[PDB]
Design an enzyme around this catalytic site. Sequence first.
Site, short mmCIF file in Angstrom:
data_model
loop_
_atom_site.label_atom_id
_atom_site.label_comp_id
_atom_site.label_asym_id
_atom_site.label_seq_id
_atom_site.Cartn_x
_atom_site.Cartn_y
_atom_site.Cartn_z
N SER A 99 0.80 -1.22 0.00
CA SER A 99 0.00 0.00 0.00
C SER A 99 0.84 1.27 0.00
O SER A 99 0.29 2.34 -0.28
CB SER A 99 -0.92 0.00 1.22
OG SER A 99 -1.36 -1.31 1.51
N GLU A 116 -3.89 -6.86 -6.74
CA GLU A 116 -2.91 -7.81 -7.24
C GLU A 116 -1.48 -7.42 -6.90
O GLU A 116 -0.61 -8.30 -6.84
CB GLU A 116 -3.05 -7.98 -8.76
CG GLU A 116 -4.21 -8.85 -9.20
CD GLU A 116 -5.55 -8.15 -9.06
OE1 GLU A 116 -6.55 -8.83 -8.77
OE2 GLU A 116 -5.60 -6.91 -9.25
C1 LIG Z 1 -7.62 -4.21 8.58
C2 LIG Z 1 -6.56 -4.95 7.79
C3 LIG Z 1 -5.50 -5.34 8.81
C4 LIG Z 1 -7.06 -6.15 7.04
O1 LIG Z 1 -6.04 -4.12 6.80
C5 LIG Z 1 -6.84 -3.64 5.72
O2 LIG Z 1 -7.88 -3.21 6.09
N1 LIG Z 1 -6.43 -3.67 4.44
C6 LIG Z 1 -5.03 -3.59 4.08
C7 LIG Z 1 -4.39 -2.32 4.56
O3 LIG Z 1 -4.78 -1.90 5.61
N2 LIG Z 1 -3.43 -1.70 3.88
C8 LIG Z 1 -2.43 -1.10 4.57
N3 LIG Z 1 -2.13 -1.48 5.77
N4 LIG Z 1 -1.09 -0.72 6.09
N5 LIG Z 1 -0.93 0.15 5.10
N6 LIG Z 1 -1.78 -0.11 4.14
C9 LIG Z 1 -4.27 -4.65 4.83
N7 LIG Z 1 -4.07 -5.76 3.94
C10 LIG Z 1 -3.82 -7.01 4.26
O4 LIG Z 1 -3.83 -7.83 3.40
C11 LIG Z 1 -3.59 -7.55 5.65
C12 LIG Z 1 -3.49 -6.75 6.76
C13 LIG Z 1 -3.29 -7.30 8.00
C14 LIG Z 1 -3.16 -8.66 8.16
C15 LIG Z 1 -3.28 -9.48 7.11
C16 LIG Z 1 -3.12 -10.96 7.32
F1 LIG Z 1 -3.89 -11.53 8.26
F2 LIG Z 1 -3.35 -11.59 6.20
F3 LIG Z 1 -1.87 -11.14 7.66
C17 LIG Z 1 -3.48 -8.92 5.86
C18 LIG Z 1 -4.21 -5.30 2.65
C19 LIG Z 1 -3.85 -5.95 1.49
C20 LIG Z 1 -4.03 -5.31 0.33
C21 LIG Z 1 -4.58 -4.02 0.29
C22 LIG Z 1 -4.95 -3.39 1.47
C23 LIG Z 1 -4.73 -4.05 2.67
#
Ligand SMILES: CC(C)(C)OC(=O)N[C@@]1(C(=O)Nc2nnn[nH]2)CN(C(=O)c2cccc(C(F)(F)F)c2)c2ccccc21
EC number: 3.5.2.6
Length: 271
Positions: A49, A146
Site C-alpha cells: 500500500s 494484485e
Molecule cells: C484491517 C486490515 C488489517 C485487514 O487491513 C486492511 O484493512 N487492508 C489492508 C491495509 O490496511 N493496507 C495497509 N495497511 N497498512 N498500510 N496499508 C491490509 N491488507 C492485508 O492484506 C492484511 C493486513 C493485516 C493482516 C493481514 C493478514 F492476516 F493476512 F496477515 C493482511 C491489505 C492488502 C491489500 C490491500 C490493502 C490491505
Amino acid sequence: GSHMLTNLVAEPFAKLEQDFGGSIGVYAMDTGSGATVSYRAEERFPLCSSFGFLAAAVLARSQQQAGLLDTPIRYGKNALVPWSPISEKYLTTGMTVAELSAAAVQYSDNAAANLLLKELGGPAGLTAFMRSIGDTTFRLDRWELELNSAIPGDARDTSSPRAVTESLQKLTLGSALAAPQRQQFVDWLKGNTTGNHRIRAAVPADWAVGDKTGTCGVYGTANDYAVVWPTGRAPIVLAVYTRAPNKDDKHSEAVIAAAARLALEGLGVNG
Ligand SMILES: CC(C)(C)OC(=O)N[C@@]1(C(=O)Nc2nnn[nH]2)CN(C(=O)c2cccc(C(F)(F)F)c2)c2ccccc21
C-alpha cells in the site's frame, strides 16, 4: 568512516531481522547532518500500500492542469474493491480528486487508489512520474489488490528503502513539487491514520510525523516511510521495509517500530 553510522547498527539490525524470521530493509537520512544509516537499503521490497507517491503524482499533475484537485469523480459499485472504508461511504455521491488522494494516503483506500491510478495512466504513469523526479528504482506494475502478492524474487511492484527515502525527501522537503503542493502532500501524510504502531511508535511524543504504511498481508511483508521533525531540528526521512520467506509468515508492526528506533539511534537522535 563515511559508513561508520551504518556499521554502528549493523549487528543490532541483523539480530532484529533474525528474531523476525525475514529480511529488514532500512534507510534513514538526517537532512541536517547529511548522515545516513543503511541496512539492506538497496534491496528490493514489495511496496504494498505504500505506493503516498500516487498522491504526489496527482499533486504534480495539478500544477499543470488547473482545478484538478477539485474535480468530482463518480464511480459505480464495480469500482469498489475490498478495504475501501472511505470511498464506499460516497458511492452514491462521488468524491473529488483531492478527497480520493487523502483517502488513499490516510486510509489506504483501495478503490480510491485505483481510481487515481487510472487518472494518471495506470501503474506505468505512476512509474513515469517517479522517473521524472530521478527515481530509477521504483516500479509499479499492477493494480489493487494484485500488487500485494509479494512473491519472493519478484521485482514487480517493488522499490528500495533508499530510493523510497530519496524520493520522499524530494517530494516533501526538496523541490520536486511546487510549494503549495509540497505542503499539501505533507499535510496528507501527517493525517495518516494507519501508522500509529510503526514509525510513529518510535519517535518522541512532541515530534511531528508524516507517514504512509504498506501491508501486503502475505510473506511477512509490511512497511512504513516517514518524514519526522524533531522539535526545533532539521527533519529526518526514513523508510522501513520487511519481507519473509513463507507466504504464511506474519508481518510485525513492532519489528517495524523497533527498526525505526535503531535507525534513529544510529543517526544520533533518541529512538
Ligand atoms: C484491517 C486490515 C488489517 C485487514 O487491513 C486492511 O484493512 N487492508 C489492508 C491495509 O490496511 N493496507 C495497509 N495497511 N497498512 N498500510 N496499508 C491490509 N491488507 C492485508 O492484506 C492484511 C493486513 C493485516 C493482516 C493481514 C493478514 F492476516 F493476512 F496477515 C493482511 C491489505 C492488502 C491489500 C490491500 C490493502 C490491505
